[model samples]
Target: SISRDEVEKCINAIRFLAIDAINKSKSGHPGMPMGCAPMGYVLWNEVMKYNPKNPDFFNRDRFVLSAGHGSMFQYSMMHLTGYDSVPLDQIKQFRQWNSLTPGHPENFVTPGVEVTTGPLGQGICNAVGLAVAEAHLAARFNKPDVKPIVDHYTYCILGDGCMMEGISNEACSLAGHWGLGKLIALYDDNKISIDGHTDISFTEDVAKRYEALGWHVIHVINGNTDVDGLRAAIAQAKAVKDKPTLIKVSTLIGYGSPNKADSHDVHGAPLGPDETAATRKNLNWPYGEFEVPQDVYDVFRGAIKRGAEEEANWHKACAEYKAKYPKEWAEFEALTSCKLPENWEAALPHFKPEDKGLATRQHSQTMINALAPALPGLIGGSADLAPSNLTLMKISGDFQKGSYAERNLRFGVREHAMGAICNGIALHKSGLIPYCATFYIFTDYMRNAMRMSALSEAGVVYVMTHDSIGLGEDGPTHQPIEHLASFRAMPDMLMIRPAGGNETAGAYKVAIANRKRPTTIALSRQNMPNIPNCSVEGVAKGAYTIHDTKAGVKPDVILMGTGSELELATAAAGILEKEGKNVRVVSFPCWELFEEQSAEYKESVLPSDVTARVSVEAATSFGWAKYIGLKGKHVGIDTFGASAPAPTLYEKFGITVNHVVEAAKATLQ
Candidate 1:
């Protein structure tokens, strides 16, 4: 057995590294890193199977720092473990400009950081998605023969702040429902937050709640110095093969500090030099700033050798299985490498004007069903909205306990967690294309995770249906008037509002191919006709001319619309043409993608010479001014929608062809 002296020495190394770094940086949450040092050491040294040398090992266990304010805790462990992404210099430069060690664990910046976690509870939800991915891969690829090819656990360390966030509850409930046996969450039950004691706000019995939610709950009495107990808890969690586990680790907020141990003062701010000196003496640590005992490095760097052996061992079985299971091998190799099948776009169905009209949500359904067969990695479901969002895949059964091979994910009503969970699936990087659906307005509940998707480059497909007031009797509460503008303003977000079947397919094409950026596709509840010139290819351009009076000359007025209103613009163009006026109808789906186009192409679509522009949509006109200049008119509802029939709501909201026609005439003046 390894000597307890060496283990304690290694754990103190992790703690001092954080105290020094945070003190040097003059800003950071030191208490968490100090408190969680033992747990971090135990995990990195004993439990987690990882290759710091090759952080992207596909079969490696995933780790998430759900309590992200304690970023120093992760940085300290990564630095000692020799991840090239976080060297000693970078750790010293924590939270500084251009450092890989940012304020939070950003998957995009750091090599081994799995998901961005600044927003409390998102990382735990993301860990659920990661575990879901592991379980799914195991069910689909692992053969009945000599050991399963896909098998790995996902671990997350969260705290009182994470427990307080409702999203943690949402994702944990789903995790219990699905029985993710390989997922482990270690709760740092320090009972402290930025707002002082958590007792004032969060007094719920978290362990009992998790038990009720279907998880195996274990508790370590003293997490401050209970490395053996924590290790045993993780081992016990691993032993349970059918349910996720929550290890309630009762850690001190600032262990070993003479003055601040378990105090709210040390929760966020750095420990000053006097306090740090006292902590060093109290913890029996003689190391200085950014200093580590060579013995500590000796213990931590052993991971590299262990990792090499594990990876090499996996290769032998994988190779033999490749020879034996050629079909599964081919699929596994292709998917694990994140390579898409050749000509995957051919699976998306095209539509014509002669084709039958249907709500764009129905088109989303058809596109998903078609793509499901071609893109083996394409898998997802709705937030209890499959019937309304029409996002169910016909060929697959529900993804549930004992049926993890299926593609249909039933997210229930957990909108917030559903978004982050898909983000985790995408970040899992096993060539998995994860999509989640809910009402368009419900994005508000999960918008932070959607933002995290964009920030962390997770490529989650967000299918938000019931795009506007046109859903009718459901009224304003269900409608999304300002949602489009909000997401459009978010950096790196692709917001697609497809007008018809072909554009809907085109939207999927963009969503699938851009695997590094998340796309939110807003589909209409109102039936949208397949416009005459709607091109599946043109959707990639973001905005295109669907109808025009003449090719070369500037039109008297330009009519622009998206989703349901695109049909109105086309019909209004016909009316303007009959009245001896030249009109051009433009389908404006995504502003971000359109902005990506060349300045020349943007000029071609909405030429500056044709300033008499009229834009129509059954939503807020907050962002129409950029296309429809000061002199132009906008045909959209700014006020809340009232309950009525779809057509009546369109008429009352003035989102009809006549409104578009009148707006065009008024703009021409």
Candidate 2:
């Protein structure tokens, strides 16, 4: 027994802080911090290796409270443990407007928080990303002498709700298959859901399920009191090198609460003052409101200060390492500093107008090859669709688990895992740019990981090939008509759909320059022309006038399009010009990028008075109304693509040049 007195002091101290904050806020979760106090205390205080002062220290481990609705649980722990930014007042201001202690753990808004989580399973996926980033960063930069410098584990405390979510299952399966030894999930087997008990819904053997997923499963019988068992479980988890670990830590929800030890009423709402007093009395906590015991405060403060000191020592070693390896050190610093390499654009390939038309996927490969030398930190692979996605950097060898000497990662057929793993690589802080690729249709499989990329504000890239109906013969099931709209809806991500070769190059240029945002390079499976009127500089504007028919500069009608549809707009503009119609053909490659431009630039692309305009795209018409306006006509597919040849499909779906011309004529009339 590791001193029940000390454990009780720590857990109760954590509990009082949470209870005080929740009681004061009058609008926070009190029961979870009360129930899960022992778990959080044991992990953060006795088990996890972390620094409260320097939260971003790369070598420091990560701890994610997946059941984020229990916000006070995290807030109280961070405050007592002295995470520099999370002070006592912040905890007191819990759930208040403009306060640092929000209802959920927001990634950017909170210090020491790794990723944004609240939708249950997303935290587990974020943990997966963190784990994968560690592996990739270590693979790329770790030296023989630096045994554990680039290594840091991800620990998560997930409740039944997190385990019930589909994204968690998808992420957990992949984490196990990849053998992410640093990924440890502590399942809070509290047997209580929001509706009272998990027996009402969840009835599967969680440990057996995880075991089937190739995980090292350890079970702690009484997580509330058995701090030693929890410590040993964590050590056992860390000892397994061939698989990820999941420790089923069984404990009662709302533990120590006088009225509710195993009920759902206290799941989200605060416990009353009477019950709070009873809980304090029951735990024998000797303190006033938010009063931390002297010994308990000393223990946690010592732990946090020791963490900071360890970080300072690591910095010293890092300084020496930098002196010994100047170039490598500079590269590593630049990576952590969120700065892209200079002259990276010089490596981006520029296709000639006379060059034979190539599939955007093929041109994507060319772009990747060109940028390879300038971006030595760039490393990526596809979800077993390398040949199709054209995302393979053939020069770099494969990144296998045991093989740390390679750059390219082979993600097998696990698209979901590929995304989470790429996120992990990006989070490693080892001067490496990680990317993942797959068919755009399979984007559904990788949605959670994609969201995590934005949540963490990671610099990873996602290469989505066969972006739309242009992926012919593959049918509606394989084609992605609304994928762009889906990705655009996600926050902190730039979704780029280039009209042609130069636009594609421009997308890459902007993507590489944007180090704080994730990027989705949606490329076509079919060939696209280097539309003579379009230029790389023009595409940089995201939306530009490729052809102005009116000599006076102001056109009577504007024809806007992206991807293959841009060619149709060009054809229609020519036809309208022949008929003496003053038409302008605008190539709107990325709506998001165009929206980011200045109002004057946006006005110039599609004048506010240009009401008689037509928008043409082969994909869904979602997000097109902003440009086309309520009065403008939209010539695009409202349904999925068919399994037929490109020519026949285009005609059948009313996506032909003639249809665009007709739509333009109808709109102008």
Candidate 3:
């Protein structure tokens, strides 16, 4: 049991850290750190098993503050435990540019931060990812007599704001579906939000909901000060091996604030000096301010130092494990660090022109089949679109709820959760390469998770098929006119829409080579001709002049296209060239990749002087402006697609070769 003075000192330390940081930045939410200090203190101090010295230590427990605005709780714990990433003063400079502490808890921005969290529900979703990782690693690598080398638990503390958000529901359903026994979520059941009590907008039965989701549910009546109850609930959570656990801890908002305990004002605003002084008196924290009693510091130092020593033991055990299990060790090192085995490109299937002009999605399926045998850590599934997305690997078994050891996952219709789960797979640091898939039209369902993938720099592949109105009879509701632009607009997403069989292989090559960022392969359902001129090297350049003018020089009219529309561009160029016009055909597989090329390479593909060029694609023409200047005409859909056959859809939407030719002629005018 912790001494009363010791607990008060530690909680007040976190409290004052949040207050000072928020006061300095004038741009942060301090309510959570102030209100939820008891929960944070209980978990970080005694309940969790972790090594602060090695943030990546295997077998160490994982913690996520799902309501990440209360980041001071985490930052203070990191500093006190000697995690080396967050120093004390760094907290003082919270939200400053270039500081390790940012406005949001970003994994890549701050060391030891597990996932990028700012959006309301993503942190909890990311918690689901973390739990998924723990289960998978434990199942795959843990040996019966290996002294529990792969055992660890993940604890997530989420607030009402986190649980009420839409994405939280999506991810929680999948978390329950997966039966992630290693996951333990502590819901900060505080009634207050920025508005008022949760009764204003949120009144769902949370425990009952988790029960329906197949989770083990518990309740802590006196959440504010019940360290024993919290600890016991966590212990019980660990005993359940068939489902994830959720402990609803009912706490008062601004628990220690003198006059703001249940008020909405305490949710975001700071407590005044008088309030702070009185609260300190109520908690029996006699220290003036920012001062931890020497004895209390000693106790914290002893407790945290034991964690460091425990990690040192884990290090020694891992060293022996590596020697005893050389194959698993090498594989684990290779996967976690995102390092590709030398010559992985050799394994990617290279399609020949004679191959039946399969749909790009079909080619993608072939590529995945050929590559899976060699890349054992490569894992993924689809959101009710595996058959269409062509992302399933034949070599891998299904990762069902009962079998966490399998490499392949079935994400169902939960694209949002699938995205976050893929992020967890990447962050598990056990060397699992994860991929997720869905129809391009449904990317809106997983946009927040996609953004977190970029922010965490996770090596996740998002495979989206039926990329355009080419879905045909499904009509406008099933089509994705702006999906390409939407993904391209994200910070570090590589949106690749391959032109044909060989280009599909090219997209996989680029995705595998760059393991730092997320790549979204937008594939076409319509079969496309394997143009003999399109090369792997050309696709590697992101965009290239596949067929140029007869004079072997810069063309007067350039037709640009990607995916299935490459056919339209090439066919149109052939007819325009017969009319004695210099026609160039360009295949733009990935604009994000193309933008990374040299200025000279960009000029070569789309010359600055060629204002007569026409851009052709099967989707909206929103992002084609930079390459296609003001004078250029775009052959694209400006409205929703009609219910018809794919070819007729192309005709109705003005995405056919005839329209490309007309647009090229109009550009010449």
Candidate 4:
């Protein structure tokens, strides 16, 4: 294994490509690509199994660069290995406008990259989720005594910065407890961050921490010239049968550069031409920038033939699997197609006006249980808030190591990791639907991951309960005042606060339909009666008239509200009607959905002639101006709420029916 000089050339060829690409951009991190080239070679040229011609091969091993600042490292390997997504010219165009290679690894931008990893710790969590999906699919499809239908490994390379994040702690703890043996991580133990050395902020025993977290740990002391060592570590990691593995790969930052090797200056800033020339000479690479030798090309391009063989083997196994396991193959093929089953919408509950009072979260639970049997793809759980969020699928068991086939994912108390994990499962592209839940206010803990799901087009359902001050004595900290406006501001996010049972069902329908955008569904802690004229069809409109005046007559005062406050608008409309005012009640469940409605439909709901409008909501009055004009008055709580009973807080905070009536009359004045 040590006899091949051409192997060294293969490694250094990738290195110079990265160095030159970053130097071309005049902006990027060069140290990671330079230092980790040997590890990259071991993975791309020897250890990992993948089909370069088709990056979306169903069972191919995944690679995520958690330290995405070293994106060129991933780009170089992909280019040399023959992935169409990363052509050689694309490497030259790295970080340039409209190139496949963005500064960070975006799955949408590049087909070969699995998930977006610019957000340091999120990548490791996503890898855990990806591993979970693979385990789930394998358990459900594979026959016990024959060749398995689903088999793959999830590999991630993280650095010191990823270790410093709490999100990694949350996800890794779950990964250990679940015993995701197929997940492997290579920790680039460079002891460096953007702001110089990690000793200033991080100086803990990472291997000891991972051991406590129940991961099998190994070490490689010299990563610079040790492709064999990297290969050995990966092989050993694969042999473990229960626990996930971590290889602490020790390497100098920017190894080939003469002056910048092991220097903090090489961490981000591109090595200038003078320093680059010195590095090229020091490494004894005589080729010009972006040039590759014939031997290096021959070695790297061999992956094409190797990958084709690997893919053909899967196809052969799949053919045999189809013949032996017909029923399982039916489900497997459907899951692979990423489409919903016929009549899946029939399972969504239809709550009538006479259906009595219940919390929206309870309605959410009903929808979850009903949809679980109808749509086998539906799978997720609360972040240790199952009882509170009412998000359990009554028939499914916990998704554990020996029972990954059962799909009630117990994500523990990790809100951030739960969000990121769902992102991984959603983006796994197996038609496996994922949903996670917690108290609405706790979204602050995992906001970034939720936003990442939106940016990356991962359709994750966020079932958030206890939406307002109505959560009562939990006080200001537990209450969510500005949360609605905040999520509304997030692009590609469907923020829906359902009024009652019917709207709750509608929210679920919309969530399932949107396979590329995330939905944050805000649910109430208190009971809401299924009001007359409130229907699921109305919720689909985003804003629909629940109670309007005669067809020919325009309303003098239009009342608009969302969630539990919709009841107040209807009640206030009755009071205004008693005073000879032509009042209308409009249930506004989702603003984004309404925006997509046509101008005629929008005008029908809120006529241009209706200047005197009143709005009521338990949330902040910030975003209501879009509907209620300057002349209109709003009934809402602007400041933080105090500790009291839900009803008492409603009265004191001016979120009562009386307050809504007062706002309506005031707007009429």
Candidate 5:
């Protein structure tokens, strides 16, 4: 049924689009797009199910270009397939400022792009997450009569560089362990890098490695123009239900360039005018630049009709599903719309001063337990530190190879993979709110994924425990000193360190409410007292006066603090008050949120009259200078911690109530 000439025309269209776009911009990687046109034509024209009219159509097959430098390949396919977001004008404006077609594919900026990918191995990890979301939702909602509305596939095209990244191995290992049968990756085994041939560095038997990881591997000997071989590989991959698939398709770099077909010269920079003319002649392309034959447009534009009908059929099935299962339907609708259930906040627990104090991590566990039943979308796990992080959902079973409907996820010890995987789940946008937990010091291992989450606007709640040197006896290596300042500086990231139960609940409230941003909640390993006047509303405000001067009078010295150190500030305020000094104590949980508050509200909390101030925290004093003016004093540790009892460490490091009181008194001078 397939015509050879028509398919060739379509392939040529993909190649010319990339070549023309790069030539116009005077920059971009055109070689991969030129070589990988056959794969793109096969996937978009025959394999993938997507509605160009509705890019966010749920249940559509997800695609990711892990080899993101070849972004023109994706943009060309999207435009040809009638994706309105990527018009011909946008293609001409590639890599320009304010254009949808950036050098790399950005999901937030481009409608058809699934995930923002450019950091080599991240896109493949994100694919694993997309597959995970699909599997979990299918397991939860699919019935014998409903015909499985959540079923879909996640596909990714990666190159040699993606295989070199450690995060890819970490995520792929877990994907194999979980048996993500719907996830398929196509490796463009072109054997060429930016520097030169991959033989200089990467020469491993990738098929064997994937087999060891429990994947079904296939080899496409001629990827440059073998349409049937790639189609058969996909069919074979879909046949296997217990493992994911990897098709190692051997391709030629710059497939049609006469002089630079397999050379590094064509890998990055645009082909010059002479080489471009020679490539056009080599490929027998007689059309002008950026011009496609009507036959080729007709072949690719068929996707428009096919995709529209596919989504329409799905909508009909959903309506029937709603009629058949009203209760489950209501929950699904609420989740997909990112709406919390009515009275959801009432499920959150609150504590008083008289109640027994507990570590913020333990309070976090309580919050998880209370919210899990109310918020069905809440799902997460720790990076082999669930006991320490206290992130386990007690009511839900583990999310394993056979039981994906469970809320609890076992992320093993892969911190970096855990963060990236969570981002993928968040980007799925199927009403799934993913949270990842780990010891605070290990955040360095996952910083890139966290940054990507913020940049891509993935609402991932990062739960970091053992926030400071208070996690003593574990040595300086386990403690986090400068982490608070580092994350606070990260753009679009809301970092909060809660002091007690009420503050912990407040942190969660803000995280869940901000569906377009990421949040990091750093919790203490030691017990913290429930301070009076600490409310969920106050936490949303970022900072608040937990205890002010008597009768609203101006204080001579103000004490500002966060986490367990806030208790120290309050204790110091008590001592200063007894000595006939007017002192106020303030709890500052999140600096970013407080910055968003009104100028009048900010001035009310830190009055200009109160020039003398003391800031207290167990971490480094790097960012406290702004709060504690040049005339004020800061009570914090500037160096790393040592192994000892937490109480001994706190006292030895001068982070106690006595230190805070001294700092407050010193600031008065």
Candidate 6:
């Protein structure tokens, strides 16, 4: 229990740092730090287990500021709690160039920040992921006498804007359904947004809503200075081990502001100098800008020694667990470091040319089942599309309550939450390779989260099926024509449309190899043949010659394809070869990976001298110009697909072998 004066001192320190930083930058939101200081103090100072010296310490509690415009709130706490990356100067720099303290909390840019949170609900969903990872790891590693090695809580501070985002509701529903007791969210129920009061639009009963969603809801009537109430709420949350918790702490938007304490003016802009000075006097603070009392430093700096001891204890427990359970300990150590077991790829199923062809989605399922046995960390599921996406693991049970150790996750129908949640798991730093699945068109639903995964350097595997119009009668609405090109343009994202079983295996290999970038494997609902040169090595190279002209002869025209369309290019090549056209066929699986290849390798695959090229795919041709060049032609759907059989749609869209041959001849002319 902290003394009233001591708690007040710490709270004031948090508020003043935020005010000073915002004042220095001449920009930023100050109302959040002013209002949420009490909750922040309780979380960082008393509730959370962390190490300022080693912010990346495994098993440390994760803290996310879901309302990222309130980034100054988090930055101030980091500076006060002895985070070296967030020194006093960084606070002063605020949102300046090349500073650690950005306007939003970016996990990659700032130490001690768990995830990049700016789009309101994203961080709360990320908190769900962090909690899921912690729960799964604890279920897998902790034994009765061994002491729980993977136990940790995930806390987040979200606001009215965050609550209004549908993504937050989607993720919160899942978190509640999954019974993530270690996850707690402190709602800054200040009732203010940029436009004005939340009463203008958002007037729902959030506490009852969370309760209906299967959460333990605690309400703090007076959040401004309710230290004891906040503490008791957190304790109640921790005690409920079967459901997630949300503590709605009602406080003013700007607690100590002289004129705008409860107004929207303090939500996003800086408090002007006069108002700041008035706030300082109102709070009874005597310190200057960016200045903290020695007593406050003494109180907060204790986290340094405390964090060291906590980490030391965890290390000792790990050592003892290793000695007692050597085999499990060895596997745990390897997985935590993101290291795969010896010859893990040997478990992948092999495909032969004579074997009956299967849909790429089926092939993905084969890979999932084959890889699940060897890769303990490979865990995830589809968004109510598991059967169609073929993402279920045959060897594992569902990851539900009392079954957290199961490898397969049931993400329901919430694609938005599914993508962000996978990001959270990947960012957990526990070598837990997480993947999420849905129809390729549904990538539109989860695209923002996928982009965040790339931006934040989270290695999430996106298993997307029904890649094109080949999905048959689902029609244009469900068919993804431009999704491929959309993802292709995103930085740090790998989009691979594997043509067959072999290319599917290749895509998985490349995805697993790159642990810092996200990979989206677009598979087909239609069956695809096992092309001759579709090897894992070729997939890693991004593009490879699957069929060619006579040995030592330069091709007159090149035909390229991806996904289910690869067979069209190959068939067209066979026709042109008989016509004495000297045509070569190339399997282009991933544009990003191909661009990563050396200039020489790219030329070797598609000679620059040969300007006559044709690209055939049952999708939009937006990005084909780069591959085909000036004299080339593209065979693809320039319009929306119609509802019909897969083959009829292909023919109607002119994406067949004849279209490819016609396009190649046109390019040659």
Full-model lDDT, candidate 5 = 0.90
Off by over 4 Å in 1: 193-196
lDDT of 4 by residue, 612-665 (tens): 998889989898889998988889988988888899999888788888888888
Candidate 5: stretches off by over 4 Å: 195-197
Count: clashes, candidate 1: 0
- lDDT of candidate 5 over 469-582, digit per residue (tens): 899899999999999999999999999999889999999988887778999999999998898887788889898998876976889999999999998998899999999998
Tell me the lDDT of model 2 at 623.
78
Each model's lDDT: 0.90, 0.79, 0.79, 0.90, 0.90, 0.90
Pick the TM-score winner: 1
Q: Which stretch of 10 consecutive residues in model 3 shows the poorest summed lDDT? A: 288-297
Q: Using lDDT as the measure, which candidate wins?
A: 5
* lDDT for 620 (candidate 1): 80
Model 4 off-target regions past 4 Å? 1-3
Candidate 3 local accuracy as lDDT?
0.79
Among residues 3 or more apart in sequence or in different chains, the pairs in candidate 3 whose N, CA or C atoms overlap within 3 Å are 335-431, 336-431
Candidate 6 vs. true structure, TM-score: 0.98
Model 2 vs. true fold: TM: 0.94
The C-alpha RMSD of each candidate to the native structure, in angstroms, is 1.1, 2.5, 1.9, 1.3, 1.4, 1.4
State every prediction's TM-score relative to the real structure: 0.99, 0.94, 0.96, 0.98, 0.98, 0.98
lDDT, candidate 1, residue 306? 85
Between candidates 1 and 3, which one is better according to lDDT? 1
Which one wins by TM-score: 2 or 4? 4
User: Candidate 4 — number of clashing residue pairs?
Assistant: 0
- What is the TM-score of candidate 4? 0.98
lDDT of 1 by residue, 1-669 (tens): 478899989988988989898888898899999889999999999988888999888889999999999999999999998899999989889989999989888888989998899899998999999999999999998888766688899999998888878999999999999999999999998876555356787788999999999999999989988878998999999999999999999988888898998789999889999999898889888777888999889999888898887777778779988888999999999988998899999999888889989999999999999999999999899999887789988899999999999999999999999999999999998989999999999999998999999999988999989989888898778878888889988999999999899999999999999999999999988787999889787889999998779877678999998998888888899988999998888998878889999999999899988899999877788988999989999899888888888888877777788888888888878
**Candidate 2 lDDT, 265-375, residue by residue in tens:** 778777778888788788887589877877787877776777977787778877776767667767667766656677778887776668777777887888888887788
